[PDB]
Subunit: 98 residues, 5 copies
């Protein structure tokens, strides 16, 4: 199994790593029908989503949990692995340090 | 998909954006039958619910209630709410926070 | 829908509103068989439960209420009011409101 | 219903109240097959477990077991002072039935 | 039941105890399909995973995997010192079976 976000990311098609190296500027969360999604934003101008939604179901909910608490604690994100065939780019993985 | 709360809100009928720019004044939570809901309040005088589940959105209602609770307790400044205004109190569809 | 804990409370029989205006003094949680409950306590001497499960909507709510009491206790968050069923010993929590 | 941990404890066979009046010294959590459990420790020398869910447990206890493990983790992380533990003492380590905290 | 992480580690095959006595350096989490996993990293050079749920996991492990990942995240965010890890050493990276923290 991969031992880093970059390794994991290189396994998938239509992905790229973003080096964020920053805390989340804004956190948006919606329960509107067909837009049950999370949107985060950075002062870089970068916008990301956790897409509207079976072990992936639990993982999707975990990701949204992680982004929320990461925003609330002002935790510095190292990288994001995102799918770049979506607008905004959809999050596949997150890494944080230190 | 939408890239902001304002864009998301615009996709829907009977919605409006409230600018809060404030922390939540009060959090109310009920487990009473037929009223399994949260109610939040602001010093502006605004009152909103997350509304009782009824006829993918089920986990989202739960997440919103989660978010509002931790937001209240940490006194986190809410930016905007997107709400349905065909209900009283207005029902939350989306929330945004900026740091 | 109701707009406050007081309005909500007045929709049900065998309820009343206690004005707590204080943090939780003690938190007790049990996983014993048929006593899967939370008990909370205040300086006033008041004692309340989240009572053992008997609707499908309510099961998720009972669990949330217990989550809420726990973190309310750990953060020393002032409870404004409790809406409670007074046909139980101790009184059983239907709703909670929090404001400083 | 019982109105205190002591009252509740007295309702079951093979239980006692350990008065702890201290924070958790160590939290141990396992996802190893058939030992999906939590062990907690105090500087008194006390070791306790939340038992693995099994045939001795009724359906209603399953969500409660998960809750108790939640509480112990957050209790450990926050250095929250535990007042009493109600434990079953026919297990090794003693098994947590209930916990109480006072501020 | 075992009364410590080392005792627990000794009930299983293909396990070893890593003594960390350190907070987590990095936390990585993925919802990518077939890689629904968490990876953690320490200053010592060590790397660990909580592996994707799979056929090798029994049904009681499913909630424990989710819990282990909940624990690691919050451990990372609070900078809480991890004492020991019980890891399966027949996976790369080593897979977490148990965790202990002490202060
Ligand atoms: C309001 C807000 O936060 N964002 C809105 C904004 O976002 C785009 C802009 O910020 C531009 C900068 O001109 O960058 C777009 O991203 C590029 C990306 O650029 C690189 O990363 C960004 C963050 C900057 O640092 C650039 O200097 C970098 O070159 C390219 O590498 C990538 O290949 O293509 C996208 C172009 O789409 C921002 O787009 C958003 O964020 C990125 C990460 C994607 O997820 C994309 O889908 C998002 O839309 O402007 C857009 C409209 O263009 C929206 O209004 C955003 O809300
Ligand atoms: C005490 C308390 O918190 N809430 C009770 C109160 O709520 C209403 C009042 O706060 C009035 C004051 O004018 O505004 C209502 O909202 C209006 C809204 O007003 C605008 O926004 C509020 C926050 C204020 O800042 C106003 O000055 C603004 O003009 C209008 O713009 C909107 O179009 O219509 C509503 C009323 O229909 C408050 O209503 C509550 O909160 C809003 C956001 C909705 O969710 C609404 O459904 C709520 O009722 O009075 C009401 C009864 O009028 C209840 O007793 C509340 O509990
Ligand atoms: C030790 C402890 O915390 N509780 C034990 C105690 O609890 C009862 C006492 O604290 C008495 C003291 O008068 O009050 C009971 O509550 C009354 C209630 O009194 C009013 O509210 C409380 C908060 C106090 O402020 C009183 O001074 C107030 O006047 C009345 O409002 C109500 O009509 O009647 C109840 C019960 O008669 C305490 O009862 C407990 O808490 C209340 C809120 C209910 O949930 C009730 O069911 C509880 O038993 O004594 C009991 C046994 O009587 C147990 O030993 C508690 O552990
Ligand atoms: C390493 C560690 O933390 N614990 C290991 C230890 O645990 C036992 C010791 O701490 C002995 C010391 O004699 O006490 C055992 O508990 C007794 C209990 O003793 C009293 O309470 C403890 C907490 C201390 O304060 C003692 O000084 C007190 O005398 C007796 O009162 C009771 O009647 O019987 C128990 C034993 O059953 C400790 O046992 C552990 O903790 C208790 C609370 C139970 O849950 C028990 O099952 C635990 O084993 O030694 C054991 C060896 O079996 C393990 O190595 C522990 O990990
Ligand atoms: C970037 C990063 O953090 N880690 C990458 C790194 O990890 C390996 C290295 O850090 C080497 C350094 O020699 O150690 C490997 O672990 C050994 C282990 O060594 C002992 O533990 C480490 C942490 C050090 O403190 C050593 O001094 C200790 O002696 C031996 O005990 C064990 O028998 O064998 C492994 C060799 O695989 C690190 O391996 C990673 O972490 C361990 C715990 C396993 O989980 C393993 O699967 C991991 O790969 O290099 C590897 C690839 O070589 C990856 O890129 C890591 O991400």
């Amino acid at each position: 199994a991969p031992q880093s976000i970059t390794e994991l990311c290189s396994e998938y098609h239509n992905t790229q790593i973003y080096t964020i190296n920053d805390k989340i500027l804004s956190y948006t969360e919606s329960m509107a029908g067909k837009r049950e999604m999370v949107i985060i934003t950075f002062k870089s101008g970068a916008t990301f989503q956790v897409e509207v939604p079976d072990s992936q179901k639990k993982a999707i909910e975990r990701m949204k949990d992680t982004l929320r608490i990461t925003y609330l604690t002002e935790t510095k994100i190292d990288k994001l692995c995102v799918w770049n065939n979506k607008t905004p780019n959809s999050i596949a993985a997150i890494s944080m340090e230190k």
